[PDB]
Every structure is written in C-alpha cells, then in structure tokens.
C-alpha cells in the first residue's frame, strides 16, 4: 500500500489537498488501478494454492 505507482504520492489525502478535480482524478486513477491489480494477484495466488 506504500507504492505510489507513478503518481505524485502514495497518500490519497495529499493528492486531494493540493490539486484540482480534473488533475486529481488522473492521479487517483493510477493508485486505484495499481491496488486493484495487486489485489487480483493475491486472489489468483490463493486460488492456485
């Protein structure tokens, strides 16, 4: 959860404190995609085990 995935920061509340909506959604979507694919990796490994 501490990876920023190419965004400006890994903390979700610091991107919303110094950015505007159009420019904040672009940064938030990278974190959303990274965490979604991390959780997908976890569930696939669990299925095989």
């Amino acid at each position: 959860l501490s990876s920023n995935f190419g965004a400006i920061s890994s903390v979700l509340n610091d991107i919303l404190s110094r950015l505007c909506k159009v420019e904040a959604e672009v940064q938030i979507d990278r974190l959303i995609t990274g965490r979604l694919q991390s959780l997908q990796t976890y569930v696939t490994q669990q299925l095989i085990r």
Partner: protein, 247 residues
C-alpha cells in the same frame, strides 16, 4: 455511518506577510544578479492586493491556485528581478532562451508560483533607463537556482584577453527602457515564490479559523493542511522534537 463534524487546527500566527515590502520596493535587481529572500512566520492572505496590485502573469506549478487558502507551507523563498516584456514566458520549467540559459534557470520538478507585473511608470524614463543588464555570452549553461555575477571579458577561444582586442566582448548588455516603445520592450517585475510542502513545522500559513477539538467521533480533521477522516484518541507515543506527524 457518515461523518458529522469538522476539526481545524492551525498554528497561532497573527502577522501579515510583507506584501508591501516585497511587491512595492524602491528598486529591483537585474536578472543576472537576482535576489533571494527568506519568508517565514506570517499569514499569506493576499486579499489586500486586490485593490493595489494587478498581475499580468500568475501561474502556479505543483499546486492549485484555489487550494492556497487552506494549505500551510513549510519553507518559502522569494526571488525578485526585472526582465522585459518578451522574456516573461522564459520564466518557466523546460524553457530555452537567453534568460533561461545564462541568467535564471528553474528546476524541472518545481513547486511554487511565478507572478509578474508591468511597471512602465516607475522603471522607464523618457531619455532611457540603461540600468538593468543581462548576460548574453557564457561558456555553458547554468544549473538550477544558481547565479553568475562575474564581469570578466569574454572570448570564444577560451583564454583571457584585453577587450581592446578584436575577438573580445563584454558579456553584459543593457536593457534600453523607454516610455515610447511597444509592449514587448517594457519593464516587467518578476517574483518567483518557491516552497516545499509537509516536511517540517509550518511557519507561513493560511487565513483559516481554528476549531475546538472533538474526541471519539468520526470527524474530518485538518492539521496544517493534512485533511483526513477518522476518530481522535489521546496518545502515549513520544515524538522526536520538531516532527509533526508519523505514518
């Protein structure tokens, strides 16, 4: 559950930032010898500038302009100089030109704001104001936030020379400022504000009102611009001195 509450905590700072001292000075330096001043321990209201000073250029990198009132900055430096009208577009990251190469360079990862305004009534005379200079010859470019105020004679060979010679030039040129020229040949005063966010205790901050603490309830807190949502409990953890928050 949906949160019902709000907590705002800010440092106890009452002074106003020296807007008049920085923006309204007697005279500004040249661009090749730009001046840096540290700013601390004040409140950046900037609402007093609405009836006095009007900026042709105001652009902010790394933050939003509408978020500057609820935010709380850590270390602020102000860089002041004077350029002409057509050089104001060179005060930006990733730019080239005489000013961006030999006089003033910005980092690519720049957080701050650039604000410039026109001053023809005070910095321009009828006979000519040949007081502001800029460097147009130099062996190589400049690193960011560095200056070179030397005035040695220049020669393309790379060796010292006495400037009554043939291939020797004085590296500085004078801005010729009149009151009867175009808009691209009029004096402009530029101030670059450089700040960093969320490292240290914040000393210059914003004009927001504080609020009493609420304990043991899911409320939206705001500690020096660090917004969030959670429940607040007393602590027994010990911190290093001058360290604000931990993760």
């Amino acid at each position: 559950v949906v949160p019902s509450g709000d907590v705002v905590r800010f440092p106890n700072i009452t002074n106003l930032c020296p807007f008049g001292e920085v923006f309204n000075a007697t005279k500004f330096p040249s661009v090749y010898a730009w001046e840096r001043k540290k700013i601390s321990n004040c409140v950046a209201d900037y609402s007093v500038l609405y009836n006095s000073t009007f900026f042709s250029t105001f652009k902010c990198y790394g933050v939003c302009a509408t978020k500057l009132n609820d935010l709380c900055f850590s270390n602020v430096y102000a860089d002041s100089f004077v350029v002409k009208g057509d050089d104001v577009r060179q005060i930006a990251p990733g730019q080239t030109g005489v000013i961006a190469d030999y006089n003033y360079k910005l980092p690519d990862d720049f957080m701050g704001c650039v604000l410039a305004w026109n001053t023809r009534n005070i910095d321009a005379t009828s006979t000519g104001n040949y007081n502001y200079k800029y460097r147009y010859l130099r062996h190589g470019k400049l690193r960011p936030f560095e200056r070179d105020i030397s005035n040695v004679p220049f020669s393309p060979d790379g060796k010292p020379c006495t400037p009554p010679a043939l291939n020797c030039y004085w590296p500085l040129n004078d801005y010729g400022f009149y009151t009867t020229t175009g808009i691209g040949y009029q004096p402009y005063r530029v101030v670059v504000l450089s700040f960093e966010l969320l490292n240290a205790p914040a000393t210059v901050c914003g004009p927001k009102l504080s609020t009493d603490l609420i304990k043991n309830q899911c409320v939206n807190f705001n500690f020096n611009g660090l917004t969030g949502t959670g429940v607040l409990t007393p602590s027994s953890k010990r911190f290093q001195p001058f360290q604000q928050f931990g993760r």
